[PDB]
Design an enzyme around this catalytic site. Structure first.
Site, PDB file in Angstrom:
ATOM      1  N   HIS A 152       6.607 -15.989  19.799  1.00 54.58           N
ATOM      2  CA  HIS A 152       5.951 -16.880  18.848  1.00 54.58           C
ATOM      3  C   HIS A 152       4.672 -16.237  18.309  1.00 54.58           C
ATOM      4  O   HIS A 152       3.557 -16.559  18.732  1.00 54.58           O
ATOM      5  CB  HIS A 152       5.657 -18.236  19.489  1.00 54.58           C
ATOM      6  N   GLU A 194      -4.426 -17.246  17.971  1.00 56.23           N
ATOM      7  CA  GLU A 194      -5.278 -17.093  19.138  1.00 56.23           C
ATOM      8  C   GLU A 194      -6.301 -15.973  18.879  1.00 56.23           C
ATOM      9  O   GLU A 194      -7.492 -16.105  19.201  1.00 56.23           O
ATOM     10  CB  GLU A 194      -4.462 -16.801  20.399  1.00 56.23           C
ATOM     11  N   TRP A 204      -3.396 -22.929  25.010  1.00 63.58           N
ATOM     12  CA  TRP A 204      -4.549 -23.076  25.901  1.00 63.58           C
ATOM     13  C   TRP A 204      -4.743 -24.484  26.481  1.00 63.58           C
ATOM     14  O   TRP A 204      -5.714 -24.742  27.191  1.00 63.58           O
ATOM     15  CB  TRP A 204      -5.845 -22.565  25.237  1.00 63.58           C
ATOM     16  N   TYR A 234     -13.289 -15.523  26.152  1.00 63.62           N
ATOM     17  CA  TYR A 234     -13.161 -14.348  25.291  1.00 63.62           C
ATOM     18  C   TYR A 234     -14.015 -14.332  24.022  1.00 63.62           C
ATOM     19  O   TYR A 234     -14.900 -13.481  23.866  1.00 63.62           O
ATOM     20  CB  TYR A 234     -11.695 -14.173  24.899  1.00 63.62           C
ATOM     21  N   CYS A 272      -8.555 -12.423  31.516  1.00 66.90           N
ATOM     22  CA  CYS A 272      -7.458 -11.584  31.978  1.00 66.90           C
ATOM     23  C   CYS A 272      -7.540 -10.237  31.278  1.00 66.90           C
ATOM     24  O   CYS A 272      -7.693  -9.196  31.933  1.00 66.90           O
ATOM     25  CB  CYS A 272      -6.123 -12.261  31.678  1.00 66.90           C
ATOM     26  N   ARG A 316      -6.938  -7.323  34.053  1.00 67.59           N
ATOM     27  CA  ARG A 316      -6.992  -7.448  35.520  1.00 67.59           C
ATOM     28  C   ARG A 316      -5.807  -8.218  36.118  1.00 67.59           C
ATOM     29  O   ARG A 316      -5.473  -8.069  37.302  1.00 67.59           O
ATOM     30  CB  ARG A 316      -8.285  -8.159  35.930  1.00 67.59           C
ATOM     31  N   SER A 317      -5.185  -9.056  35.299  1.00 64.61           N
ATOM     32  CA  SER A 317      -4.161  -9.971  35.782  1.00 64.61           C
ATOM     33  C   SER A 317      -3.167 -10.194  34.658  1.00 64.61           C
ATOM     34  O   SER A 317      -3.551 -10.549  33.542  1.00 64.61           O
ATOM     35  CB  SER A 317      -4.791 -11.298  36.224  1.00 64.61           C
ATOM     36  N   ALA A 318      -1.891  -9.994  34.968  1.00 65.54           N
ATOM     37  CA  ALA A 318      -0.871  -9.897  33.936  1.00 65.54           C
ATOM     38  C   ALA A 318       0.356 -10.729  34.296  1.00 65.54           C
ATOM     39  O   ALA A 318       1.151 -10.347  35.150  1.00 65.54           O
ATOM     40  CB  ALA A 318      -0.484  -8.430  33.717  1.00 65.54           C
ATOM     41  N   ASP A 319       0.471 -11.882  33.655  1.00 61.14           N
ATOM     42  CA  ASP A 319       1.673 -12.714  33.739  1.00 61.14           C
ATOM     43  C   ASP A 319       2.714 -12.002  32.873  1.00 61.14           C
ATOM     44  O   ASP A 319       2.690 -12.097  31.642  1.00 61.14           O
ATOM     45  CB  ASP A 319       1.335 -14.105  33.196  1.00 61.14           C
ATOM     46  N   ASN A 374      -0.351 -10.548  24.916  1.00 59.27           N
ATOM     47  CA  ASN A 374      -1.448  -9.585  25.022  1.00 59.27           C
ATOM     48  C   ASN A 374      -1.200  -8.287  24.247  1.00 59.27           C
ATOM     49  O   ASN A 374      -2.085  -7.785  23.569  1.00 59.27           O
ATOM     50  CB  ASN A 374      -1.765  -9.273  26.497  1.00 59.27           C
ATOM     51  N   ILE A 381       5.405 -10.956  38.147  1.00 59.97           N
ATOM     52  CA  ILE A 381       6.410 -11.837  37.577  1.00 59.97           C
ATOM     53  C   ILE A 381       6.413 -13.108  38.409  1.00 59.97           C
ATOM     54  O   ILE A 381       6.635 -13.061  39.620  1.00 59.97           O
ATOM     55  CB  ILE A 381       7.812 -11.217  37.648  1.00 59.97           C
ATOM     56  N   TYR A 382       6.153 -14.247  37.778  1.00 63.52           N
ATOM     57  CA  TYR A 382       6.167 -15.509  38.517  1.00 63.52           C
ATOM     58  C   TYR A 382       7.570 -15.815  39.056  1.00 63.52           C
ATOM     59  O   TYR A 382       8.571 -15.513  38.408  1.00 63.52           O
ATOM     60  CB  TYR A 382       5.649 -16.655  37.632  1.00 63.52           C
TER      61      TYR A 382
HETATM   62  N1  LIG Z   1       0.103 -18.390  34.053  1.00 65.19           N
HETATM   63  C1  LIG Z   1      -0.616 -18.101  32.832  1.00 65.19           C
HETATM   64  N2  LIG Z   1      -0.173 -16.990  31.909  1.00 65.19           N
HETATM   65  C2  LIG Z   1      -0.908 -16.712  30.688  1.00 65.19           C
HETATM   66  O1  LIG Z   1      -0.516 -15.677  29.871  1.00 65.19           O
HETATM   67  C3  LIG Z   1      -2.155 -17.589  30.320  1.00 65.19           C
HETATM   68  C4  LIG Z   1      -3.201 -17.557  29.243  1.00 65.19           C
HETATM   69  C5  LIG Z   1      -3.019 -16.666  27.972  1.00 65.19           C
HETATM   70  C6  LIG Z   1      -2.715 -17.513  26.716  1.00 65.19           C
HETATM   71  C7  LIG Z   1      -1.231 -17.901  26.791  1.00 65.19           C
HETATM   72  C8  LIG Z   1      -0.873 -19.230  27.609  1.00 65.19           C
HETATM   73  C9  LIG Z   1       0.603 -19.688  27.654  1.00 65.19           C
HETATM   74  C10 LIG Z   1       1.707 -18.818  26.894  1.00 65.19           C
HETATM   75  C11 LIG Z   1       3.138 -19.348  26.882  1.00 65.19           C
HETATM   76  O2  LIG Z   1       3.389 -20.380  27.413  1.00 65.19           O
HETATM   77  N3  LIG Z   1       4.027 -18.814  25.871  1.00 65.19           N
HETATM   78  C12 LIG Z   1       5.347 -19.447  25.827  1.00 65.19           C
HETATM   79  C13 LIG Z   1       5.335 -20.565  24.749  1.00 65.19           C
HETATM   80  C14 LIG Z   1       4.672 -20.041  23.462  1.00 65.19           C
HETATM   81  C15 LIG Z   1       4.729 -21.163  22.417  1.00 65.19           C
HETATM   82  O3  LIG Z   1       5.758 -21.372  21.843  1.00 65.19           O
HETATM   83  O4  LIG Z   1       3.751 -22.176  22.470  1.00 65.19           O
HETATM   84  C16 LIG Z   1       6.319 -18.330  25.455  1.00 65.19           C
HETATM   85  O5  LIG Z   1       7.501 -18.484  25.551  1.00 65.19           O
HETATM   86  O6  LIG Z   1       5.754 -17.154  24.934  1.00 65.19           O
HETATM   87  C17 LIG Z   1       1.367 -17.499  26.099  1.00 65.19           C
HETATM   88  C18 LIG Z   1      -0.144 -17.037  26.053  1.00 65.19           C
HETATM   89  C19 LIG Z   1      -3.946 -18.889  29.253  1.00 65.19           C
HETATM   90  N4  LIG Z   1      -3.790 -19.351  30.647  1.00 65.19           N
HETATM   91  C20 LIG Z   1      -2.593 -18.662  31.229  1.00 65.19           C
HETATM   92  N5  LIG Z   1      -1.844 -18.939  32.478  1.00 65.19           N
HETATM   93  O1  LIG Z   2      -4.349 -13.447  27.949  1.00 65.67           O
HETATM   94  C1  LIG Z   2      -4.003 -13.708  29.255  1.00 65.67           C
HETATM   95  C2  LIG Z   2      -4.703 -14.800  30.081  1.00 65.67           C
HETATM   96  C3  LIG Z   2      -4.151 -15.097  31.485  1.00 65.67           C
HETATM   97  N1  LIG Z   2      -3.025 -14.330  31.998  1.00 65.67           N
HETATM   98  C4  LIG Z   2      -2.343 -14.707  33.249  1.00 65.67           C
HETATM   99  C5  LIG Z   2      -2.572 -13.808  34.488  1.00 65.67           C
HETATM  100  C6  LIG Z   2      -2.341 -14.844  35.589  1.00 65.67           C
HETATM  101  O2  LIG Z   2      -0.944 -15.088  35.694  1.00 65.67           O
HETATM  102  C7  LIG Z   2      -3.003 -16.116  34.992  1.00 65.67           C
HETATM  103  C8  LIG Z   2      -4.516 -16.131  35.286  1.00 65.67           C
HETATM  104  O3  LIG Z   2      -4.606 -16.429  36.648  1.00 65.67           O
HETATM  105  P1  LIG Z   2      -5.690 -15.641  37.618  1.00 65.67           P
HETATM  106  O4  LIG Z   2      -5.321 -14.035  37.637  1.00 65.67           O
HETATM  107  O5  LIG Z   2      -7.048 -15.895  37.098  1.00 65.67           O
HETATM  108  O6  LIG Z   2      -5.437 -16.302  39.092  1.00 65.67           O
HETATM  109  O7  LIG Z   2      -2.823 -16.059  33.534  1.00 65.67           O
HETATM  110  C9  LIG Z   2      -2.326 -13.274  31.131  1.00 65.67           C
HETATM  111  O8  LIG Z   2      -1.232 -12.627  31.619  1.00 65.67           O
HETATM  112  N2  LIG Z   2      -2.840 -12.974  29.772  1.00 65.67           N
END
Ligand SMILES: Nc1nc(=O)c2c(CCc3ccc(C(=O)N[C@@H](CCC(=O)O)C(=O)O)cc3)c[nH]c2[nH]1
Ligand SMILES: O=c1ccn([C@H]2C[C@H](O)[C@@H](COP(=O)(O)O)O2)c(=O)[nH]1
Ligand SMILES: Nc1nc(=O)c2c(CCc3ccc(C(=O)N[C@@H](CCC(=O)O)C(=O)O)cc3)c[nH]c2[nH]1
Ligand SMILES: O=c1ccn([C@H]2C[C@H](O)[C@@H](COP(=O)(O)O)O2)c(=O)[nH]1
Lengths: 263, 263
Positions: free
Chosen positions: A51, A58, A80, A94, A146, A166-169, A177, A208-209
């Site tokens: 998306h 953002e 957010w 940020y 992050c 520092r932290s990467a979902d 990102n 990876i969650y």
């Molecule tokens: N755990 C965690 N990970 C993060 O990256 C994150 C951040 C970064 C901003 C962020 C939050 C949710 C999604 C997300 O949900 N994207 C979905 C839906 C996008 C849309 O359609 O609204 C996706 O499928 O990319 C994509 C980017 C805020 N707090 C967070 N907490």
């Molecule tokens: O732009 C961003 C903001 C947050 N996070 C992810 C990393 C973690 O999964 C979570 C933040 O949790 P902590 O590392 O603070 O516990 O959101 C990202 O991947 N990209």
């Protein structure tokens, strides 16, 4: 050329089980890196529909120096929501640090403008840095940054950018990102009269969650397609770009893959 | 296993000519990484004799939160001489930020102690971060931080550390930086009751100074030897380590190679 999918695959197959703040559980590795040649195409993933609308807004929101989700909502962006106060506040995250880092003297430092000035007047500087990691303000932030620290570099009129995250979902956050910083790099390059070079992504805890595993396997089964091209309309200032100035050409992704965010 | 020598070789062969602040001239690449398994041995280079005495005191000096070169001089260390004021001051550099980052509330933040607390009580935290990049104080520093931002990670009771270094004098500075952070990681691991894992070094502008080229070629001609082992005496606090507590066993380097520092 799929740095992201390769890392995603590597963490899925070799990451260690790890507990986390959100209580979700992850598989995780530390200290991984991705490199993209921005001159080759815009790194908006094609193995799932990303998306980009939310990515673009953002970033514009960061550039406004805004930390309230109101403006995001007006533009249909809800990424957010889960961390915001009832009034929509996230604390000095940020955007606030990028545009208005509070200096001890009470002045506010605009790191984005400062970085642009260096790109234009001292491109060989090794100090072209922007940090969101304001140690004295972390406690006031809904989430600590992050994507925390980044640097620009110039070689033969080509702009590169390296981010420390520092932290990467990996499933949800990182695709955003990568596209966000690629877009920022195009913006900075445009404003500095440079072409685009490399984006280097360097991660700390790359995870990876545990409730993203099925989505990841589905995505990793898909064949990558050519990347789209980014076209940016002319503006006299980076702070004057609008969503409508940002055009992604020939984006042809596989289907979107839904997954829940860890709160 | 020679991550450093390999990177040195890569920059020598492929780095691009670049001007720099010091007016010396460099060959440079951007966004390069090295990894050391600290459990395999202590990464004090064997391809030239590195003055570990200066490395160790410099780190002890950082941990004291000191920014005046006097304490270094009392211990025979001159590596910071060229940037200090006539009274020995360097401004609020590494040590000051590590131990006493000034918060907006007037309080000072001890990031080292905070990181140790997390290692002990929440090892899975993705926020175990120390930053020296205090944006509001950079202009007061004799040189902005090179080793700028670092993070700790814990997997199965094993401590890893990743450093982001924005600017890397490959021949003179980096061998010190590697040994310094390896030593710091050992100290943190000891204080947190952990074993040592990986040190990941991530660089921004990775350069060889034009007046270090002959020295580099000489070093790269030499066959690496086994790394030494680090032994740290017991202490109840990281701030109570002394030089005498730090023993390097079986360090067997090739001869020292002198080079001029760029100011
Ligand atoms: N755990 C965690 N990970 C993060 O990256 C994150 C951040 C970064 C901003 C962020 C939050 C949710 C999604 C997300 O949900 N994207 C979905 C839906 C996008 C849309 O359609 O609204 C996706 O499928 O990319 C994509 C980017 C805020 N707090 C967070 N907490
Ligand atoms: O732009 C961003 C903001 C947050 N996070 C992810 C990393 C973690 O999964 C979570 C933040 O949790 P902590 O590392 O603070 O516990 O959101 C990202 O991947 N990209
Ligand atoms: N351009 C530049 N590079 C840097 O790494 C640096 C720094 C880091 C501290 C530093 C300074 C000089 C030497 C150094 O000179 N080491 C020599 C002599 C060591 C000794 O014997 O005193 C060596 O051969 O390693 C090794 C480490 C301060 N300002 C700098 N400016
Ligand atoms: O611990 C350190 C401190 C400084 N530098 C080097 C990088 C540059 O060569 C010089 C700093 O100059 P600038 O990047 O600030 O111009 O010192 C290091 O390699 N390691």
């Amino acid at each position: 050329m799929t740095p992201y999918e390769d890392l995603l695959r590597f963490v899925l197959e070799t990451g260690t089980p790890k507990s986390d703040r959100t209580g979700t559980g992850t598989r995780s590795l530390f200290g991984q890196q991705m490199r993209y040649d921005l001159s080759a195409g815009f790194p908006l993933l094609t193995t799932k529909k990303v998306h980009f609308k939310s990515v673009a807004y953002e970033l514009l929101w960061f550039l406004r120096g805004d930390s309230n989700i109101g403006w995001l909502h007006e533009h249909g962006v809800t990424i957010w929501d889960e961390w915001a106060s009832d009034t929509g506040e996230l604390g000095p995250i940020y955007g606030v640090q990028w545009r208005s880092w509070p200096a001890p003297s009470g002045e506010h430092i605009d790191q984005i403008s400062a970085a642009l000035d260096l790109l234009r007047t001292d491109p060989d500087s090794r100090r072209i840095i922007v940090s969101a990691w304001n140690v004295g303000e972390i406690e006031r932030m809904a989430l600590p940054p992050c994507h925390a620290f980044f640097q620009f570099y110039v070689a033969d009129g080509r702009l590169s950018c390296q981010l420390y995250q520092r932290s990467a979902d990996l499933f949800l956050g990182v695709p955003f990102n990568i596209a966000s910083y690629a877009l920022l790099t195009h913006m900075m390059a445009a404003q500095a009269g440079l072409s685009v070079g490399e984006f280097i992504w360097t991660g700390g805890d790359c995870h990876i969650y545990d409730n993203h595993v099925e989505q990841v396997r589905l995505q990793l089964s898909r064949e990558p397609r050519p990347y789209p091209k980014l076209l940016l309309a002319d503006r006299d200032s980076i702070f004057e770009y609008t969503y409508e100035d940002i055009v992604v050409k020939n984006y042809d992704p596989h289907p979107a893959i839904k997954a829940p965010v860890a709160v």
